[PDB]
Design a protein around this nucleic acid. Sequence first.
RNA 1: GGGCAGGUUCCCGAGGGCCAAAGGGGACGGUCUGUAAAACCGUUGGCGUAUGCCUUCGCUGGUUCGAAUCCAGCCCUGCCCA
Length: 426
Amino acid sequence: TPEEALALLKRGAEEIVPEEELLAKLKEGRPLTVKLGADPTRPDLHLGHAVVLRKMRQFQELGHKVVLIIGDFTGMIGDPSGRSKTRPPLTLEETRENAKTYVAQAGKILRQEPHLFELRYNSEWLEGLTFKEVVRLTSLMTVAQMLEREDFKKRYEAGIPISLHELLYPFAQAYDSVAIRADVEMGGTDQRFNLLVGREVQRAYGQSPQVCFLMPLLVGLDGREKMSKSLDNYIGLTEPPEAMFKKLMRVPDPLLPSYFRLLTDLEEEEIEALLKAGPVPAHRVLARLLTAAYALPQIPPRIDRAFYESLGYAWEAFGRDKEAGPEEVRRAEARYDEVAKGGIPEEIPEVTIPASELKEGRIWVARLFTLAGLTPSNAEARRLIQNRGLRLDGEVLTDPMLQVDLSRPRILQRGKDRFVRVRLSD
RNA sequence: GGGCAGGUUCCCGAGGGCCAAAGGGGACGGUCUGUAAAACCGUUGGCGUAUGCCUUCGCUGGUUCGAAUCCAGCCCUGCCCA
Ligand SMILES: Nc1ncnc2c1ncn2[C@@H]1O[C@H](COS(=O)(=O)NC(=O)[C@@H](N)Cc2ccc(O)cc2)[C@@H](O)[C@H]1O
């Protein structure tokens, strides 16, 4: 029911604005058009994206239509939201290549039934947008209004260059809302301004101003910055279960609550239970939930206590029942425990080394780590040895000049958890 | 178009030979640890293993035995001017 729908949607949301409009729209008893755009500046989605995407999923389950806009054209312009410097240039070919991963992976969270979902690339309409149209859009706002954004304010005062093209971006995003007659636009808090310009431009085109639905930003593994591909602080949605699990175990403790609120549906009471049980046991449940969820082709409608138990775990164990749970998660958790103990994991990548790479029937340890893809350079492999960062067959290397014999397979290790098995091939 | 300050590696930065370039950040490796934080000790162009070479100091040319350094023109940014 209208009143009870808004209740669900509100949970987790930073702010809906204006709320009174969302209520009105829900009462119209019809499928609302729900806009989420994403610029594929780099490939692959992450749990950060899942924050907004999973709220889109919640809209779909209440029978509303999600429009996923692939920003192939905006992508080339570059969104200045949250940016300390002009985004480096990007071509339409590059953004279109990247967009494949977005379209593929968005399915893991979104329902794909035509009535619930539509896919569009904004280049469809933006490419043929005319100079006259651009003049009309850019007449809707003033300089002082643009420089009142935190981004440009800081950049302008501190004397950091701002390219004029950066001033166009919001109008492109706003026009998208017109092009699809958006009832609701979804975004993280970093998208506030673009969403608000969406309301301006819609009004100017004699449409109803969309509801601006703002979610909180998921902080990355570094512990401060927002999860982003570029900051290399992310957990990708299509990472192997082993990898998602270990990464979720490394989430800084202060972030745990937000991770539970933004990424799962556990009631506030259930969260505080887990936190009481302690940091490590909390991590285990988080890791299990999400690794399980994203291991599936598509996540369930809810990631809740009921989902946890349907896996094989028991809530009251509070992350002790390590034996329980499905296969991909169990072997993922096993690996984590095994590596934590200072052991070699069961399944490791094998890499064959052509015999031509040998010199006098052996290979320098440094080159071997490079060939194996564990070090970017030989110089780096030596310095990693100086810092006791490399292991051969379980034993910490100390001889940067070691000559390795590949008569039989050897296990190379870099740092705590990167392992390759190497062997010869004629 | 015309002044002045600035352009250095992933970022910010210090700067006639011994400068692959101080220091700081970030990242990486290690100890402690819970594959957390924090603290602490290291590392931070590349090359089969280097008194050798290549890549990196905005560009191009010049000077000098030798240029990140000095010079000339030129591309770019900020502040000032028009
Ligand atoms: N770590 C994170 N936590 C929470 N939300 C996150 C996040 N990282 C990204 N997001 C959200 O995921 C969405 C996609 O991010 S993004 O690709 O950088 N978005 C943008 O650049 C938008 N300007 C894309 C766009 C929007 C609308 C359009 O009509 C066209 C394009 C945004 O709503 C963003 O807020």
